[PDB]
Design a binder for this molecule. Structure first.
Ligand SMILES: CC(=O)N[C@@H]1[C@@H](O)[C@H](O[C@@H]2O[C@H](CO)[C@@H](O[C@@H]3O[C@H](CO)[C@@H](O[C@@H]4O[C@H](CO)[C@@H](O[C@@H]5O[C@H](CO)[C@@H](O)[C@H](O)[C@H]5NC(C)=O)[C@H](O)[C@H]4NC(C)=O)[C@H](O)[C@H]3NC(C)=O)[C@H](O)[C@H]2NC(C)=O)[C@@H](CO)O[C@H]1O
Ligand SMILES: *[C@@H]1O[C@H](CO)[C@@H](O)[C@H](O)[C@H]1NC(C)=O
Length: 370
């Protein structure tokens, strides 16, 4: 029963032209869960991050109206949110607990199936405990709300980093595994525009060339590191990106892995952030005159370059290769960032939703067992 958790970004509705994505562009039979990103905290209380995000929460739910087994979650936090609103939330108990109690109310008001807690990232010994405390009080209050109210319990999931260094620094893995329904490993952003050398967003395996250090910055090593630190395989949802990480090359003749980069690459027309492109933006890039598509047979992922623009991404083949690895490793399913950056319109010339469809196909008939 492999689970497929799909993140829906709220800000995708603000995209121009075709890029614009709304909750009813979602194929309600694709994913097993849809997670809406993100909400915020208004004085340590879970709330809408924008005034008529509200009607969107209502639109993203009632995807259930056409798939009643579909679970809809609300996400809190994310990258831009930072760590500060979480240290505050968890600095004292009345604050944290009244957040829990009121979040349930909030969640039930909108008829969300659960909460995805995305604190990026706890660091150090007291952040470690605050994170476990937060997860414990929420999970326990959820359990205890189900038997006072008599409804199916609210779900508790959390997104977690890939880096082994990040795991040690902020994550008591046996403890959070205990309270989380689902552990969403963000096995992407291994390399990107913060770096001055070309590297791939999401390599499954490393180059044989690689330093022992970077042999660790792979989907395979990361997911396994989590298993090593206590994580139950059936709760491990391995992250799958539908975007690629792009670079501007210092020199056009140097396009290989490790090639010097001045920084991020040209923003896509619709996502408007230099450093990455959606998959439908990748497709246009591929269609352009003399773009060179390269398959990395060691890393099992593709990248492509034209002139001084270089992008490493996931396609149908690499994602299926990862599904074969995941079934072989016995993981409980996948997490997708994000449903709105897959080619949902089918403009790439393949099917509609070609990336998530590919992963679905390869997961068919897979039962996770122990
Ligand atoms: C090996 C190692 O240590 N590597 C790290 C590397 O991990 C670090 O990169 C960061 O990784 C984390 C995952 O661990 C990324 O956060 C995840 O993944 C999602 C995709 O990257 C991320 O989506 C981003 O969310 C932002 C909001 O928090 C989006 O900002 C939005 O930008 C829009 C313009 O483009 C704007 O209109 C919106 O208003 C704005 N939204 C908000 C709320 O402000 C951003 O666009 C989006 N990126 C996308 C969609 O591609 C999620 O936040 C998060 N998912 C979760 C929590 O479930 C994070 O993105 C990575 N950071 C960067 C800068 O790439 C890296 C950082 O330097 O360090 C390495 O060492
Ligand atoms: C690009 O790199 C080559 C070496 O591969 C070098 O000879 C050339 O001068 C460079 N071109 C520039 C910096 O414009």
């Amino acid at each position: 029963e492999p689970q497929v958790l799909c993140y829906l970004t709220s800000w995708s509705s603000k995209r121009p032209s075709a890029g614009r994505f709304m909750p009813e562009n979602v194929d309600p039979t694709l994913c097993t869960h849809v997670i809406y990103a993100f909400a915020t905290l208004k004085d340590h209380k879970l709330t809408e991050a924008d005034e008529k995000d509200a009607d969107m929460y209502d639109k993203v739910v009632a995807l259930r109206e056409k798939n009643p087994n579909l679970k809809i979650l609300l996400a809190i936090g994310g990258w831009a949110f930072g760590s500060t609103p979480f240290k505050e939330l968890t600095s004292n108990v009345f604050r944290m607990n009244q957040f829990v109690y009121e979040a349930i109310e909030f969640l039930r008001d909108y008829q969300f199936n659960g909460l995805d807690v995305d604190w990026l990232y706890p660091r150090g010994a007291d952040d470690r405990a605050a994170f476990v405390s937060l997860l414990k009080e929420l999970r326990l209050a959820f359990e205890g709300e189900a038997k006072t109210s008599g409804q199916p319990r609210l779900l508790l999931t959390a997104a977690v980093p890939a880096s082994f260094e990040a795991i040690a620094a902020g994550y008591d893995v046996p403890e959070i595994s205990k309270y989380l329904d689902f552990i969403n490993v963000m096995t992407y952003d291994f390399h990107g525009q913060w770096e001055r050398q070309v590297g791939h967003n999401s390599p499954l395996f490393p180059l044989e060339s690689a330093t022992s250090y970077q042999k660790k910055l792979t989907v395979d090593y990361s997911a396994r590191e989590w298993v090593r630190q206590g994580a139950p395989k059936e709760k491990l949802m391995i992250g799958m990106p539908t975007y690629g990480r792009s670079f501007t090359l210092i020199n056009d003749t140097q396009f290989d892995i490790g090639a010097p980069a001045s920084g991020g690459g040209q923003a896509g027309r619709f996502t408007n952030e230099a450093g990455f492109m959606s998959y439908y933006e990748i497709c246009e890039f591929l269609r352009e005159d003399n773009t060179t598509l390269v398959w990395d047979n060691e890393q099992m992922v593709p990248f492509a370059y034209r002139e001084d623009q270089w992008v490493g991404f996931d396609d149908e083949r690499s994602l299926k290769t990862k599904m074969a690895w995941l079934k072989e490793e016995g993981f409980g399913g996948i997490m997708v960032w994000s449903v709105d950056m897959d080619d949902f319109r089918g403009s790439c010339g393949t099917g509609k939703y070609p990336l998530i469809t590919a992963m679905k196909q390869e997961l068919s008939g897979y039962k996770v067992k122990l």
